[PDB]
């Protein structure tokens, strides 16, 4: 510390006195994050763990909102042939927010999977389903042969083979009137120039992949000018402990020590504050217990030494820091040979001004030589 003191004063020789050299702080250990106990997820089981779905033309619409979405299960079970997202994460669906979701459940053909795509052209992409040029959502399609194919043929499902105009994005057509491909009015008669717009698939277990039935769910997410109903740590953010660390509590990133506080707070629990508008206590989302926040070490390091003449040894004073925390007060990386002696070891005194290292406490009382403070003075005399 003598050399550091010399540099601060820009002199090779120093006189008796106490000089404030530098400042020390304790950095956060690794990290900390906390959030609520999570609740029941959105009813995705009824979407993927169900029994029967709807037809391609009569695709069923569900409004998913006011619930927590646990999207991990979508990719955890790799039983789905097609799982593709556009405008949204496929994998980190648990770290995204959206006001509302629309689930479109239906059944298509294997060959028609190519038709089902954003801004695509095809029979299904025109007469049964359509997506916009700025689609924001996921499409999950998986073969449903054993689930949606009869031995003789599952003809229940239907698809709109004919339609005058292509469907607009997010549009459904459930018209059952006889389609007219000519100028001859049908007048309620089906035949020449008059055919049913909906035709039935020959879904059979023996049919090929192209002709086999595939259950498809399209989840379109919208985030309009309203608070998001799907937000937060879907899976988990826990396993924290009390220590001088940087903590992320429900949006506040703050460095401090999360101790335990014996204070009674209001039933509905949220953040805390003090007179100076500085946070001093934050809630524990999981357990109904309050935690204080305080600065780690602050303080400053000063060097106490007589003049370079007649003596060379020096002592260190750390201001307003417990003598137990001195070893980690900006250390473990400095010059090991000649810094640990002045930061650890014997000759440690806890005074009102802080911690003194390198000075031996004596019960006598002489005239003040170097004023440490609070009635404590340091002298080089034996």
């Amino acid at each position, epitope marked *: 510390p003598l050399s550091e003191t010399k540099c601060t004063l820009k002199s090779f020789t120093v006189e008796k006195g106490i000089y404030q050299t530098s400042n020390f702080r304790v950095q956060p250990t690794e990290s900390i994050v906390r959030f609520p106990n999570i609740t029941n997820l959105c009813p995705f089981g009824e979407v993927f763990n169900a029994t029967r779905f709807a037809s391609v033309y009569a695709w069923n619409r569900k409004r998913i909102s006011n619930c927590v979405a646990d999207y991990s299960v979508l990719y955890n079970s790799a039983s789905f*042939s*097609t*799982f*593709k997202c*556009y*405008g949204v994460s*496929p*994998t980190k669906l648990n770290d995204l927010c959206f006001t509302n979701v629309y689930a479109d459940s239906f059944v298509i053909r294997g060959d028609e999977v190519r038709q089902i795509a*954003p*801004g695509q052209t095809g029979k299904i992409a025109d007469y049964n389903y359509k997506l916009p040029d700025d689609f924001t959502g996921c499409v999950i399609a998986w073969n449903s042969n054993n689930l949606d194919s009869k031995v003789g043929g599952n003809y229940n499902y239907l698809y709109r083979l004919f339609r005058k105009s292509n469907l607009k994005p997010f549009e459904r057509d459930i018209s059952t009137e006889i389609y007219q491909a000519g100028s001859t009015p049908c007048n309620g008669v089906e035949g020449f120039n008059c055919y049913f717009p909906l035709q039935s698939y020959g879904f059979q277990p023996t049919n090929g992949v192209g002709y086999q039935p595939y259950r498809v769910v399209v989840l379109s997410f919208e985030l309009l000018h309203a608070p998001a109903t799907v937000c937060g740590p879907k899976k988990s953010t826990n396993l924290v402990k009390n220590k001088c660390v940087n903590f992320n509590f429900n949006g506040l990133t703050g460095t401090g020590v999360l101790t335990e506080s014996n204070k009674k707070f209001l039933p509905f629990q949220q953040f805390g504050r003090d007179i100076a508008d500085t946070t001093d206590a934050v809630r524990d989302p999981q357990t109904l217990e309050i935690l204080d926040i305080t600065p780690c070490s602050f303080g400053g390091v000063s060097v106490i030494t007589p003049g370079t003449n007649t003596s060379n040894q020096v002592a260190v004073l750390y201001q307003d820091v417990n003598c137990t925390e001195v070893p980690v007060a900006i250390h473990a990386d400095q010059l090991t040979p000649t810094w640990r002696v002045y930061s650890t070891g014997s000759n440690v005194f806890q005074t009102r001004a802080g911690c003194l290292i390198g000075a031996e406490h004596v019960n006598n009382s002489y005239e003040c030589d170097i004023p440490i403070g609070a009635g404590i003075c340091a002298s080089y005399q034996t």
Partner: nanobody, 126 residues
């Protein structure tokens, strides 16, 4: 014009640890709006993710055993994608397929996260 047909080329024999390039050409709709993905499949094996590049050419992603060694880039004006093999390994002997999927600029790894599939080009590493 409306169908994104993809054709792979450039695959061939190359020394292990050397340099090589594979070109996937896309013809049809606007390629600039299509995320691009390169996968590998060994003879008689399954398709494994190799690399992915975004539609807007913002970030690139790679699998566990191919990150860093391989690079991916794309040109929208040329409607082409170039995958550069650097520091190749003998395990890279397989058919590389190139796929276009109209997605956003986020991570895309799983084969199920892609719609189209190219013819594929055979690459051999000794």
């Amino acid at each position: 014009n409306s169908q994104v047909q993809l054709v792979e080329s450039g695959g061939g024999l190359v020394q292990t640890g050397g340099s090589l390039r594979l070109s996937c050409a896309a013809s049809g709709r606007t390629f600039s709006n299509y995320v691009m993905g390169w996968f590998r499949q060994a003879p008689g094996k399954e398709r494994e993710f190799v690399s992915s590049i975004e539609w807007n050419s913002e970030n690139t992603f790679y699998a566990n055993s191919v990150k860093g060694r391989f690079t991916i880039s794309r040109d929208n004006a040329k409607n082409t994608v170039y995958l550069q093999m650097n520091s190749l390994k003998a395990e890279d002997t397989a058919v590389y397929y190139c796929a276009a999927d109209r997605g956003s600029s986020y991570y895309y790894t799983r084969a199920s996260e892609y719609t189209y599939w190219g013819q594929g080009t055979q690459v051999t590493v000794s």
